[PDB]
Amino acid sequence: WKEPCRIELYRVVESLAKAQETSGEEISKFYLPNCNKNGFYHSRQCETSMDGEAGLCWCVYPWNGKRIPGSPEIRGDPNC
Template sequence: MAESETQTLIGASNQQTAVDVGAPAERPRSSRAYKVAGVTLLACVLIVGQAATAYFLLSQKGDIKSLEEQNNKMKTELTRGRSGGRISLPSQMHIPMKILPEAFDDTAEEEASTGTAATLTLCQMEMAGLKPVQVPGFQPACDKQGLYNPQQCYMGHCWCVNPENGQQIPGSMSKGSVICVKPAGMFALTDVED
């Protein structure tokens, strides 16, 4: 039976013979080929990265030049300010102009002529920003003598204070205005509706 199949196979295939060589023999994998492929891939990635960096630098060239010009301009202005140019930094803190009429009374001219200097009260120093207050951004209101106004307000809330030291009267905090009256050494509170 095997001979007839072989003959049929030979006869059917026009004199071609089929040879069974078996499974291919396993060769050891070439690690050198993998190394070369990895190095080649790495080199390609690095070249593409360099090309992308060059492209982005060239596309941002105008912006970089503009920033360099601004930097040079600021450097020249700063050096000119130090060398006696028109730009100079203040050497001391100044009192804001809006509080000057309230901070100094009419006796300042008389004291200046006699040689005594005018001193600011605690309220005036807090109002001028020369002394820190407990609530950031709050500036107390002072009267002409430099004492605290009996009513102080900040961000829609008002309260009564002791005019001499600015301490809040307990229980006087109210949303909106309050009237602080001082009959015979005592404070009386009256709510005022807005």
Template sequence: MSDPETPNQPLLQAATNVPAAQRGSSSRAYKVAGFTLLACLLIAGQAMIAYFLLNQRNDIKSLEEQNSNLQAEMTRGRSVAVPMRTHMAMNALPVMDVSMDEDSSITDPEKPAPRQVTDCQLEAAGKKPVQVPGFRPSCDERGLYQPQQCFMTQCWCVNPANGKQIPGSLKNGQASCRAAVIAGETR
């Protein structure tokens, strides 16, 4: 195979037969050409990035304006109330008798007086503001707060009389509110 007269001589062997002086200058030329090509590609990439940024300047400006508008709305404290299904029994709502009888001015001792609307019922109906926007407390049939209140994925225990959170009861998921609660105190 190393016979110089063989016409099917491999290309690599033919390249090695080139004199040493020519080999050094051509490899240097290939290196310079490679580095030049690499520099051209980098410059072209930078030019493309600059072009795209200039074309998207308006988009970036409108996104910045939207961001500042949203931040301004968030700092104003205005919240959007999301309709939520309240967990309140229908008999917990006060029923008022509006019939006009001739003896309506006289109160009937056998007829129970309409119940007073509680803070829990007012908060659940959205008539009284709560500290967490969008949260509506759960009330029992007497209008007191349910011992466990939940919002999103977190639950906590409260005093049923006033709805104040019991310290240390906040949990992800269901909270265990088995402790007996007596009008204002926890045991």
């Protein structure tokens, strides 16, 4: 795909919506792909949070959204 992140984002949103229907817990954080406007991945990827706590962030290759080996994972901007 020319816009891999955008396609993934749609798929993830649909699956999350579906999972929430039968979810046995109330999730306050989840991972939505962080896409740039070209439909690739921002270097920094973070969990989405709605609970007043920082989500985990890590660093990816923008062309595929896969974590860079050795990347830090912290609740804050890793400065990717």
